[PDB]
Amino acid sequence: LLSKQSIERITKILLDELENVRENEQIRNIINSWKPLPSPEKSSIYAVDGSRSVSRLSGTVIYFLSALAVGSGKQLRLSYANAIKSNYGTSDQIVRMQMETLENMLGYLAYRKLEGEKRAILMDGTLTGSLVRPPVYPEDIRSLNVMRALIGESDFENLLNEFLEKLRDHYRKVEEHLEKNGNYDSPILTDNVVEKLRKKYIDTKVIAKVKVKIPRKALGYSPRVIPIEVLESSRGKSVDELLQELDEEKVELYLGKDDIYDALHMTLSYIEYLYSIDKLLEVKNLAYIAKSFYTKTLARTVEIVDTALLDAVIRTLIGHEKEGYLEIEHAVVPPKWSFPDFLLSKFRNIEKLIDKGIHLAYVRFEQGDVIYMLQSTTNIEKILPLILHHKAGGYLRPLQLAHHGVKISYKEARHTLEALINALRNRDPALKI
Amino acid sequence: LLSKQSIERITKILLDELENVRENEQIRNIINSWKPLPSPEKSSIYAVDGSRSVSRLSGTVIYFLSALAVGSGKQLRLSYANAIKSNYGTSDQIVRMQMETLENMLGYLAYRKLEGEKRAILMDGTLTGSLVRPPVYPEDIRSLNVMRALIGESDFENLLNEFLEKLRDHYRKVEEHLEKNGNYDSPILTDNVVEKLRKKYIDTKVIAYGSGKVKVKIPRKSPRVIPIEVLESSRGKSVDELLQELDEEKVELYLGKDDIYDALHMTLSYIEYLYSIDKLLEVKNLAYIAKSFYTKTLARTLIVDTALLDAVIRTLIGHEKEGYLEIEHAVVPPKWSFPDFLLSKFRNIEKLIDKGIHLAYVRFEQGDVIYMLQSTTNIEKILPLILHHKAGGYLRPLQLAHHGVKISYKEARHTLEALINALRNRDPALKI
Numbered sequence: 001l002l003s004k005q006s007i008e009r010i011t012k013i014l015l016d017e018l019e020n021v022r023e024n025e026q027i028r029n030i031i032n033s034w035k036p037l038p039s040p041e042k043s044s045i046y047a048v049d050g051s052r053s054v055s056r057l058s059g060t061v062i063y064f065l066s067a068l069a070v071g072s073g074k075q076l077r078l079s080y081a082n083a084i085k086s087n088y089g090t091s092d093q094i095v096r097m098q099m100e101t102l103e104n105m106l107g108y109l110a111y112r113k114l115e116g117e118k119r120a121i122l123m124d125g126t127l128t129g130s131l132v133r134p135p136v137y138p139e140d141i142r143s144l145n146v147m148r149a150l151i152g153e154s155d156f157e158n159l160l161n162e163f164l165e166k167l168r169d170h171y172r173k174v175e176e177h178l179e180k181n182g183n184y185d186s187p188i189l190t191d192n193v194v195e196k197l198r199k200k201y202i203d204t205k206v207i208a209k210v211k212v213k214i215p216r217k218a219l220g221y222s223p224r225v226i227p228i229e230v231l232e233s234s235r236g237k238s239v240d241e242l243l244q245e246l247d248e249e250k251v252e253l254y255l256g257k258d259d260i261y262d263a264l265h266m267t268l269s270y271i272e273y274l275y276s277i278d279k280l281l282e283v284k285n286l287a288y289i290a291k292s293f294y295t296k297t298l299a300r301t302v303e304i305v306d307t308a309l310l311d312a313v314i315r316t317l318i319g320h321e322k323e324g325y326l327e328i329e330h331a332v333v334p335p336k337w338s339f340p341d342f343l344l345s346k347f348r349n350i351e352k353l354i355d356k357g358i359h360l361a362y363v364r365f366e367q368g369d370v371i372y373m374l375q376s377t378t379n380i381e382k383i384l385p386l387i388l389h390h391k392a393g394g395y396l397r398p399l400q401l402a403h404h405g406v407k408i409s410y411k412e413a414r415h416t417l418e419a420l421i422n423a424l425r426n427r428d429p430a431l432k433i
Numbered sequence: 434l435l436s437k438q439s440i441e442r443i444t445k446i447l448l449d450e451l452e453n454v455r456e457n458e459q460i461r462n463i464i465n466s467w468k469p470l471p472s473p474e475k476s477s478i479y480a481v482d483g484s485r486s487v488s489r490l491s492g493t494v495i496y497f498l499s500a501l502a503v504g505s506g507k508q509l510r511l512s513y514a515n516a517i518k519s520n521y522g523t524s525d526q527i528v529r530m531q532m533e534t535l536e537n538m539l540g541y542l543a544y545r546k547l548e549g550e551k552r553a554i555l556m557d558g559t560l561t562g563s564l565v566r567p568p569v570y571p572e573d574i575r576s577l578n579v580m581r582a583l584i585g586e587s588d589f590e591n592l593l594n595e596f597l598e599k600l601r602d603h604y605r606k607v608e609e610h611l612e613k614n615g616n617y618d619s620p621i622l623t624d625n626v627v628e629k630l631r632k633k634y635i636d637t638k639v640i641a642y643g644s645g646k647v648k649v650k651i652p653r654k655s656p657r658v659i660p661i662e663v664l665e666s667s668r669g670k671s672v673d674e675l676l677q678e679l680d681e682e683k684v685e686l687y688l689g690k691d692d693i694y695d696a697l698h699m700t701l702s703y704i705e706y707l708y709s710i711d712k713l714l715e716v717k718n719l720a721y722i723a724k725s726f727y728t729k730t731l732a733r734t735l736i737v738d739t740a741l742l743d744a745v746i747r748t749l750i751g752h753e754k755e756g757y758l759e760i761e762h763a764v765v766p767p768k769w770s771f772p773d774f775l776l777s778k779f780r781n782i783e784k785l786i787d788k789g790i791h792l793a794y795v796r797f798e799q800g801d802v803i804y805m806l807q808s809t810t811n812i813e814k815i816l817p818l819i820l821h822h823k824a825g826g827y828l829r830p831l832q833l834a835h836h837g838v839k840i841s842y843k844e845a846r847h848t849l850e851a852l853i854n855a856l857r858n859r860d861p862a863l864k865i
């Protein structure tokens with residue numbers, strides 16, 4: 001009921017966004033370079049989404065990933081089930097990586113089995129959001145440097161290579177089960193293969209905590225500020241000399257066995273994920289759709305606005321409520337920090353994307369229906385109509401199908417899993433929540 | 434469905450946990466130190482919990498917060514509803530902080546209403562969990578230091594103390610409302626007071642710059658703490674030149690409005706929250722009860738998850754028996770999470786640092802579970818007061834606070850967006 005005390009202070013906080021949107025833009029002159037929508041071209045297509053569910057038992061998070069591709073062709077599904085012990089943040093970011101990795105895989109594999117003159121793939125989110133901020137950020141990058149420093153710079157390279165090789169083999173081996181059954185219960189590689197790898201590259205070098213050194217930059221800053229006292233302490237130097245030493249400097253550090261064993265796992269899972277973005281970018285027409293992303297850190301690397309916001313701008317200013325599309329003038333590039341130098345050479349389609357960038361456009365499929373954020377590898381002009389063959393209505397069918405189908409209104413493992421973990425040995429952890 | 438290889442993989446992963454626990458490092462000689470519950474003592478008590486609902490509109494989070502106290506007096510309650518601009522971590526983390534802010538207040542005020550020879554508060558969580566990894570962090574620290582550098586030390590401490598004051602009149606106003614109606618709709622201060630404090634200490638120190646940015650002169654003075662972007666900017670120069678320009682206060686920064694604003698907001702919330710712990714820390718018998726807790730840190734920082742040990746026993750010693758087991762050595766908090774220029778202001782936290790947190794595993798009845806029990810004082814003292822209220826499998830004031838806070842089916846579900854429908858814009862309200 002009430003809370004009404006707040007309300008205006010909500011409404012304001014809302015509107016004080018928009019009344020600052022129609023100001024700063026000065027309409028940004030762009031809304032009028034808006035181009036109503038092109039003429040449908042016939043394509044064969046697959047839309048895909050995935051959904052995860054998680055539950056905790058004590059220290060342990062238990063999750064079931066599901067990913068689904070619907071389209072011009074049969075229904076294809078990747079699913080995975082696992083448990084991993086919990087860091088409150090780091091965990092979720094791991095699950096979501098795997099989730100994302102399942103999509104990337106499903107996406108590309110789906111491309112390969114799509115026959116046609118005009119072949120396209122639709123995704124449930126933004127291409128940007130993935131590569132601008134890597135999930136598990138203050139873990140993944142830290143973990144790779146932790147690994148590289150662990151086993152050495154070259155030993156690492158082989159590890160990367162061995163693992164990719166395992167991965168290439170993986171996709172082919174997956175590719176089979178999608179033919180026969182059109183589903184797979186093990187889309188994810190890193191988990192099963194992690195133990196083996198460890199004892200090869202790791203278990204030799206390790207001796208029972210231990211000493212690595214990496215740069216101060218493999219984590220921070222946060223802050224983000226610096227003591228005054230240092231400028232005095234280091235002086236008679238040039239700001240340039242200092243910044244060198246600053247950004248450069250090696251900090252030391254100590255590592256237990258699990259710490260190592262985790263860094264390994266992270267490194268891999270990170271590598272796997274990457275390898276699916278690469279092997280995904282290979283898709284000729286790659287289509288990313290999202291009803292809502294948010295613009296923060298994006299207008300940073302330039303200025304743009306959330307769809308929902310925009311949607312209102314046009315309908316309360318230029319009056320439209322009208323169907324069509326608006327491209328953004330700037331093919332936008334990626335940041336290279338999310339991609340360690342020693343990584344990219346393995347995934348060139350990523351490397352490619354940094355040089356070429358993404359093309360973004362807002363879109364409205366109908367009337368008093370709403371505005372979506374389109375991103376694509378190729379150009380909006382080219383990619384857009386392809387998508388358009390499939391519009392059902394307020395929007396496209398196959399996306400609508402993927403969204404709806406992979407929806408879990410019923411968790412299998414709800415009754416199922418734990419009730420069989422009563423069985424094997426111990427029903428107590430099962431007790432729990 | 435299931436792979437049953439995945440199931441094996443799952444069972445597997447879990448069992449290693451137990452056996453590696455049954456490796457009995459500190460466990461071997463720990464378990465037989467298991468004591469039987471003491472006798473109950475008469476105590477007046479308020480168990481408190483809180484729940485939160487959130488929903489997204491584009492890049493804007495809507496959240497509704499509730500806290501509830503049930504116990505040896507009538508039912509006290511807090512609620513707050515609001516919106517923030519979404520940053521995946523930061524938003525969801527600032528809710529969380531606010532949530533703990535009510536639960537803490539509510540716990541502090543509930544105490545002050547208490548009648549008994551022994552008075553106690555019962556909280557739904559762990560003491561350690563919040564303060565070994567504070568909510569919204571490292572973000573909450575960088576932001577402080579941002580302002581400390583930005584608005585400068587003196588006018589900062591000026592800001593600190595003022596805000597603190599406003600917070601005192603806040604609590605009193607709250608206690609009042611609590612009395613009469615037993616409820617309050619504005620438990621949270623910062624959101625209402627931020628924009629006012631922005632004009633004072635922020636807008637003062639800044640001039641408009643270009644698109645969405647501002648030009649900020651850096652003051653001078655106790656760390657002086659220049660923002661890192663000041664070395665960034667000064668690149669062609671000698672360090673001596675830099676200080677001289679710092680001395681004469683030529684130096685300006687080009688950083689963005691919103692970042693600063695947000696940094697401010699983050700700062701206040703974080704203080705309104707620290708006030709919240711410092712107050713709740715005035716409670717003389719304060720207990721926290723969590724069935725499961727954990728973290729990768731919860732071993733290393735100087736010992737095990739309840740459910741593992743719960744299992745280990747019936748599967749070793751055969752007890753499955755009621756009782757408790759007190760972890761021997763009190764735990765102090767890691768001091769990094771609590772800025773030194775802050776605790777000066779919050780004694781009890783500062784005090785909590787020195788004295789530390791007593792922890793014990795407690796099984797209230799029979800083959801029921803093992804809750805984690807944490808307190809500002811000795812388990813031996815507190816546990817008796819708790820036990821006075823043992824309901825059943827576990828304590829009533831709490832199971833009430835639980836069931837009672839669950840009391841939200843989504844209110845704003847039909848409601849809020851429908852009256853946002855009104856004012857002018859339904860557009861975002863369209864979930865679009």
Ligand SMILES: Nc1ncnc2c1ncn2[C@H]1C[C@H](O)[C@@H](COP(=O)(O)O)O1
Binds near residue numbers: 100126130133135293
């Ligand atoms: N795990 C994770 N990392 C980064 N950004 C995320 C994540 N999950 C959701 N998002 C946000 C960021 C973008 O707006 C979009 C990316 O969708 P996607 O299809 O997942 O590429 O969704």
Ligand SMILES: [Mn+2]
Binds near residue numbers: 049
């Ligand atoms: Mn999705």
Ligand SMILES: [Mn+2]
Binds near residue numbers: 482483484558
């Ligand atoms: Mn709770």
